[PDB]
Amino acid sequence: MSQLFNNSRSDTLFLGGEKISGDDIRNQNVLATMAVANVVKSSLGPVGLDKMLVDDIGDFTVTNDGATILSLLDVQHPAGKILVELAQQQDREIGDGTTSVVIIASELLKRANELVKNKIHPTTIITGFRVALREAIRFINEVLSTSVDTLGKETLINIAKTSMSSKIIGADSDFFSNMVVDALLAVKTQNSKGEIKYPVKAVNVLKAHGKSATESLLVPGYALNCTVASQAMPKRIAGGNVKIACLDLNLQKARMAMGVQINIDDPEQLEQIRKREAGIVLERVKKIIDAGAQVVLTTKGIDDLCLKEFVEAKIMGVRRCKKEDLRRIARATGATLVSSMSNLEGEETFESSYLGLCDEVVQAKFSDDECILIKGTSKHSSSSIILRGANDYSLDEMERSLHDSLSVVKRTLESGNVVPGGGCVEAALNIYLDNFATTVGSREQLAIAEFAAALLIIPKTLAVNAAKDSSELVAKLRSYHAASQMAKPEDVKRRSYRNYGLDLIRGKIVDEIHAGVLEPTISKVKSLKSALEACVAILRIDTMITVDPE
Amino acid sequence: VFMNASQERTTGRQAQISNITAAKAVADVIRTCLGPKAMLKMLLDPMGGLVLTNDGHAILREIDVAHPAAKSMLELSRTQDEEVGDGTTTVIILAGEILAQCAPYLIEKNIHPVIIIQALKKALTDALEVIKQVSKPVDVENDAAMKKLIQASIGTKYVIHWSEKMCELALDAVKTVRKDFEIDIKRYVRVEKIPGGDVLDSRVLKGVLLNKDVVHPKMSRHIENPRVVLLDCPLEYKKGESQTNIEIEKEEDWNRILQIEEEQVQLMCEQILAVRPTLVITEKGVSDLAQHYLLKGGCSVLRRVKKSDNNRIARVTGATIVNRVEDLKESDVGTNCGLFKVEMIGDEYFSFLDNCKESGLQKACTIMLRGGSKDILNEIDRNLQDAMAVARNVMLSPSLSPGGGATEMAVSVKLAEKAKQLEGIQQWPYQAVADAMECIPRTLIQNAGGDPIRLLSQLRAKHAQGNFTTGIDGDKGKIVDMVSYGIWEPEVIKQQSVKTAIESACLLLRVDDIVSGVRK
Amino acid sequence: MNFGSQTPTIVVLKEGTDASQGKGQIISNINACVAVQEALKPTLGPLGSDILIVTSNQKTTISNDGATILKLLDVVHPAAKTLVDISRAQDAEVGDGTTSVTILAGELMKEAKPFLEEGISSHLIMKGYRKAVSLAVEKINELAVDITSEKSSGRELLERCARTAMSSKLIHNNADFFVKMCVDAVLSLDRNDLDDKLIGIKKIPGGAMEESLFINGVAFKKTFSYAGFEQQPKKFNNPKILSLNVELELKAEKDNAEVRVEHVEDYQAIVDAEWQLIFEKLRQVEETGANIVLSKLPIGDLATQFFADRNIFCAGRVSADDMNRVIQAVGGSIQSTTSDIKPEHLGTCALFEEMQIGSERYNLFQGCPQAKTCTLLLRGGAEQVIAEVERSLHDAIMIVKRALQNKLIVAGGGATEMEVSKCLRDYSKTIAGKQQMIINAFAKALEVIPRQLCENAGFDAIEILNKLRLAHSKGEKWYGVVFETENIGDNFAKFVWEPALVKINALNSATEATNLILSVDETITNK
Ligand SMILES: Nc1ncnc2c1ncn2[C@@H]1O[C@H](COP(=O)(O)OP(=O)(O)O)[C@@H](O)[C@H]1O
Ligand SMILES: Nc1ncnc2c1ncn2[C@@H]1O[C@H](COP(=O)(O)OP(=O)(O)O)[C@@H](O)[C@H]1O
Ligand SMILES: Nc1ncnc2c1ncn2[C@@H]1O[C@H](COP(=O)(O)OP(=O)(O)O)[C@@H](O)[C@H]1O
Ligand SMILES: [Mg+2]
Ligand SMILES: [Mg+2]
Ligand SMILES: [Mg+2]
């Protein structure tokens, strides 16, 4: 929207690029804001559609997550990097509301910039947003609903289906709902002296393309992606109480410390020194084999020298794997991860307490890939999910689709209070802020009234991607919510409304409780706080100064 | 400017139209590659070689296609190959037609893609039940039934003339690798090829075929009962991980250094002679000094062997790979070796190891092939991998699906009957799936030279009344039944064709905009 | 079957043609109109600021109104040309409010931005504007009060309406002297026939603006002044003005006539014959007693030599637009035949004097009570000030020009836009449909004119609009913003009045300009 550029003044000189001041900066900030905003508008909601990005090498990426889309976009505009890093901050902390926080913060900048031209000062505009946000958070606490009189896991099943929508797994969300809920409950641990916490990414995601996505099997235990060292080793271990050895020590021919230089005056010593180099490693592997360990995990590669004893003893060898993957195996099976093998005494020894326990250890071949399936862990339970699709590009989307579903359920069990989704909160915060600021009034009433209409961008964008009439649905969301705000908590009726609306599939106003769409209260909070700081930082900038690179 | 973006951004309905048109062009190239009368496609690689085949997997693999949507169709070729290995051309043709036949709308009706996707998921579930009802189980222990089953993928290839000989090679290769459930893998099946010769003279021989002649002239090239021992360590003198750096004060110490190097290697040779092996195989290089003490005891020396061949040798003779010579015992020595011989061929020498054939570990076998040239060998090797993969599905899944386009047409009839009973808003996406299923048997008519209008009209009428086994004849282009046609195909091949094609179509329907060259 | 090698695909449109469709094309078309509006926002209001524009020819032109500003810059984007057409149509038809029409036309597109982002297609948005523009015009006619009801004077009616257009120009401080000129300029013209070519202003470099004069006569300036000039008296009492379309020359523009004479004695006759033919037309002018001779075509030397002894002033090479302006005030009209000149075709006047200003001499006709024409001689330090005051008086004469045809009193200064907007809000409450939000947006879009009034004045526009809506609640009219007293109040007591053709055409042009671009969802540009 900027034409004629700007006239360079000779009386004003600075090294590097020219300095632009006035309304041109705020016009370019919104222009750069609407550039990244229009990308995530079409990807929002179950009726939304994602976009494709070419990497210039021929590979592409198909994902509905707004964080990955903005992460692949490198913005040269200084204020544009704020919204890019806002999405990376959103999924890292909460894990949900990534597309919404970008669209909410975009409308906050578009309406505030129109208010700056109204001559109201930006700090007064910022004051109006912060005062309205303080009361908006108090309204979120009033609409909280604690799960009660629910049968089984249906509470977590219905909430997990909300994050599965808008993504390729939305059609299969009925089958995938039981896999996500049972995955985070198996990794349940205890910390902070009684506080329940869950690990992130602990559930392994394996990619094997074939069959169908609805046939994806949920393994009652952890699964590790690795190839067997020797093909002569058994791929299936029969019998219970299988001992797993988690080790960080590689078995290889190794050079002595670089600070040592061997000088021998006799040729007769060449036979024993060369033999002892391989014999030192034998002392470590011999005590492990005698303990009856069926499976030996190793962080680093193992030469064929020590793989011979594993075949004769029927022990399955393992080679380089991720360091963070071997930690949860020892914790689940009861083994203790050993970075370096040593004892309190000055003599080497091996204790049976360092060996894990499980029901069985098997290696299953999915398509042409071979992975180890560890089922029936002893000390702590675990889980893994093997995603199946038509091509590897769909599996890349299902990983981010599964990772986002794990973050929503994680925040669900931390706080029992939940709020209804599907544009119900954004429509409820509109009317609550309309009656607000009417008492204070004066100049701040205009800045607060625009903050209420700024939250309307979320419910209106959902109806555009559905190829339906938005004005019909938005007028209904304002009809049921507005009249019920003044209700007195007796004679009932009344507030039974306003708790539901904006169903994109059928285009009608239906109850979200019977529908099952819900959102955790953690996803709603901190989303407007992060969007406010992104709006305040950009709005306060009068002048942008660019320095040419050296 | 802003970031890396814009140029010409394709938005609206034309972004999905470009995805349908580009993906449709993928199946149009191999459209003539379907059927027993299918032609061949010659490919030109940047390396300078030549690839001539009718298999849509190898055709779409070497061809470089630059397009966001069209590359997704290229990935579907490895989905059918790695999971099964048969039906790669059918999946691409089916998935290419589904996207065109199931979604001409949104150019007209303006139906939302997810609404169509919800109908595709219900159409995939009903399509699996129709295939299960038209599938008749077959006995896996009948040799005569497995021969006609392997010829299914052979009928569309060039080896159909040798099909009577080809089914002998594919049946014995899968049965040997099969281990008792009944899990087999092609990593132990050897693809090694012999240039020249007669195809009828090619036979599957147990053991491993080595290209290396015996090292020494006194090494026996004919042994009645060979005893094979595998050694990963080289017979040469090991320098060690750390430098020795001998400081020699007296002149007699230097000669002892070179004298021990002869005795140290001799010490490793004396430990080998304890089990008196007739044939010694070393993974690494061998010194000319170590072969003398092994020749005195009767041991045979060979060239360095790759790691891939060492695993197949241990399975045939039952030997165990022994790295440490001091730990070598008689229990790890391979036995029950039928014959050891070396035949002369102008290109290279060839060493034969025969198995005594008489539960334990799965046996390994190599497939010898005599072609007319080097490229003909690569074509039959791709034909054997497609023919032997059929025997793997019947063993794991005894169910047997109808072939000759009868599977896809049987689903199209059932989808048309339930389309009127479903009604609703999903009737159009659900009925459009049946139109994409009848395109595969329609291709059989176009390649045969018949009239698809009159043949497909009578095929649908005779399908309800006559039987579910009615299909299109490839050679005569007539209406015949698969019962009297004598050729059938496993259900796993048909299930992978329906699932992969529909699940891939749902990915391309969700595309909104396309931006190229963002960054690396 | 193919000809050879590979055949590339044929693109439908010609290579290099830019074509884009969908909702993104309309937003790009609206942003093109808003970007042009950003330059004309500070210009609105009596406190508005001028815009300096330099073209590719380095020709300096300063214009406050949006009609000439859009003529200087060359517009490329098609949607931005729509704002240029409404500025030139408002200038030619009326000439006042050319800036306000662009502000209203672009604001309607700005209020339609949140409607296009929703699921509402542009066809239903235009229906609300087409319905609201019909009711807004009917409100202006109801707020117009006839001036003859109070039985006031007709001269003072044109004075108060002329001082309104003098705002935002350089005349605002000098309007005391300058308004008394243009008001007397329209009264000389016939009430049935009003012409903008007769009021044409000459550009005289140098001088002071307050030194200008107004005389019912005209000034044809001068071109050459051949031999015999400066001897003729430049001050006449009661001269007889004569005009000639015939050219006085000796064989100059006449076609070549071959003359063949076979005798020496006959050659002497043809030489003196040309002297008799030229002096015959000159003698017939003296017989009529005409003291002033004007001509469109050049005047020969022998002519000026003949009238030099008779003191008769003669000036030729006068433009046709000036001569047509002279023939009205001089009574009788040009006779191109010297022998056909009759006494009733000659003109007269009470006084004639030629004075020199800015190193340029001008013949001024004075003392013509029956003159139906007028002249305006403007001065100034800069040459750009003269072009600004000339365009300032041009739009000011159009106020009193359109007022004599139809006399209607309409509020101004944001008083009309706020009164019509409230009547639309009460009507929108009974719609109960998609048009309810469009009419409320249309009434809110009409408030943009009072916005730039307060913004350019330094006062806040939030507090003023709040005081308006509370005041407009009860029945009020002419109530608007006042810059002098700093408080908003009744403009009827301030005597500031505006014609009805300004507000009626502003609503019809803004709606027509808005519905034209919103109806185009795709733009194709070849080459
Ligand atoms: N099935 C559904 N029905 C109605 N509303 C939904 C549904 N799924 C998600 N939503 C709404 O869409 C909003 C965004 O969801 P989603 O796009 O999945 O997350 P993100 O915006 O972080 O990508 C949520 O606030 C939720 O209320
Ligand atoms: N002789 C034949 N007559 C009719 N149809 C056949 C014949 N052979 C194969 N088909 C059909 O062609 C399809 C693909 O078979 P084939 O060409 O062997 O695999 P691919 O298409 O992967 O090369 C099968 O579904 C089968 O129904
Ligand atoms: N004396 C005045 N008091 C209040 N408002 C005025 C006055 N004179 C002009 N205006 C307002 O200023 C606006 C701009 O007027 P001006 O710039 O003089 O001509 P134009 O309307 O052609 O741009 C008009 O719409 C009018 O309503
Ligand atoms: Mg989500
Ligand atoms: Mg085949
Ligand atoms: Mg004006």
Short mmCIF file of N, CA, C and O in Angstrom, two decimals, chain C residues 2 6 18 37 47 91 98 167 176 218 227 380 399-400 413 421 432 458 471:
data_model
loop_
_atom_site.label_atom_id
_atom_site.label_comp_id
_atom_site.label_asym_id
_atom_site.label_seq_id
_atom_site.Cartn_x
_atom_site.Cartn_y
_atom_site.Cartn_z
N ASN C 2 4.13 -36.82 -34.81
CA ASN C 2 4.61 -35.50 -34.45
C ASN C 2 5.60 -34.98 -35.49
O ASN C 2 6.21 -35.75 -36.24
N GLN C 6 10.41 -32.51 -29.41
CA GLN C 6 9.28 -32.41 -28.51
C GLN C 6 8.54 -31.11 -28.77
O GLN C 6 9.12 -30.13 -29.25
N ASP C 18 -0.69 -10.41 -17.54
CA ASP C 18 -0.93 -10.58 -16.11
C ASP C 18 -2.42 -10.77 -15.88
O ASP C 18 -3.22 -9.88 -16.17
N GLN C 37 -6.07 7.62 -2.07
CA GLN C 37 -6.81 8.42 -1.10
C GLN C 37 -5.90 8.99 -0.02
O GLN C 37 -6.17 10.08 0.50
N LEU C 47 -8.32 23.90 6.46
CA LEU C 47 -6.94 23.84 6.92
C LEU C 47 -6.10 22.85 6.13
O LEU C 47 -4.95 22.60 6.50
N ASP C 91 -15.62 17.88 -11.52
CA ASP C 91 -15.07 19.18 -11.90
C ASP C 91 -15.86 19.80 -13.05
O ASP C 91 -16.19 20.99 -13.02
N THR C 98 -14.50 18.03 -5.43
CA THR C 98 -13.78 17.01 -6.19
C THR C 98 -12.89 16.17 -5.29
O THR C 98 -12.65 14.99 -5.59
N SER C 167 -12.41 28.66 0.97
CA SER C 167 -11.65 27.99 2.00
C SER C 167 -10.65 27.01 1.39
O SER C 167 -10.76 26.61 0.23
N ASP C 176 -12.10 38.85 1.52
CA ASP C 176 -12.87 40.08 1.57
C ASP C 176 -12.92 40.77 0.21
O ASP C 176 -13.99 41.12 -0.29
N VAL C 218 -13.23 43.65 -21.45
CA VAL C 218 -12.34 42.53 -21.71
C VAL C 218 -10.98 43.06 -22.14
O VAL C 218 -10.82 44.24 -22.47
N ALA C 227 4.65 48.36 -37.50
CA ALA C 227 5.10 49.74 -37.69
C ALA C 227 3.92 50.69 -37.67
O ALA C 227 2.89 50.45 -38.31
N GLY C 380 0.53 38.01 -8.79
CA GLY C 380 1.13 37.29 -7.68
C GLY C 380 2.64 37.20 -7.79
O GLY C 380 3.20 37.43 -8.86
N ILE C 399 -19.76 27.95 -8.12
CA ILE C 399 -20.71 27.94 -7.01
C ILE C 399 -21.88 28.87 -7.30
O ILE C 399 -23.05 28.48 -7.22
N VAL C 400 -21.57 30.13 -7.64
CA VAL C 400 -22.61 31.09 -7.98
C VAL C 400 -23.19 30.84 -9.37
O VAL C 400 -24.25 31.39 -9.69
N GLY C 413 -19.54 21.50 5.96
CA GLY C 413 -18.60 21.35 7.05
C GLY C 413 -18.85 20.14 7.92
O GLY C 413 -18.60 20.20 9.13
N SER C 421 -26.35 10.30 7.99
CA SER C 421 -25.89 9.02 8.52
C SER C 421 -26.78 8.51 9.64
O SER C 421 -26.97 7.29 9.77
N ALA C 432 -33.10 -6.06 9.52
CA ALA C 432 -32.93 -7.40 10.10
C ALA C 432 -32.39 -8.38 9.07
O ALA C 432 -32.96 -9.45 8.83
N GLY C 458 -5.82 19.66 14.15
CA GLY C 458 -5.07 19.34 15.34
C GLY C 458 -5.90 18.79 16.48
O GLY C 458 -5.35 18.14 17.37
N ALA C 471 -25.49 15.06 20.32
CA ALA C 471 -26.26 16.23 19.92
C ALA C 471 -27.27 15.89 18.83
O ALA C 471 -28.41 16.36 18.87
#
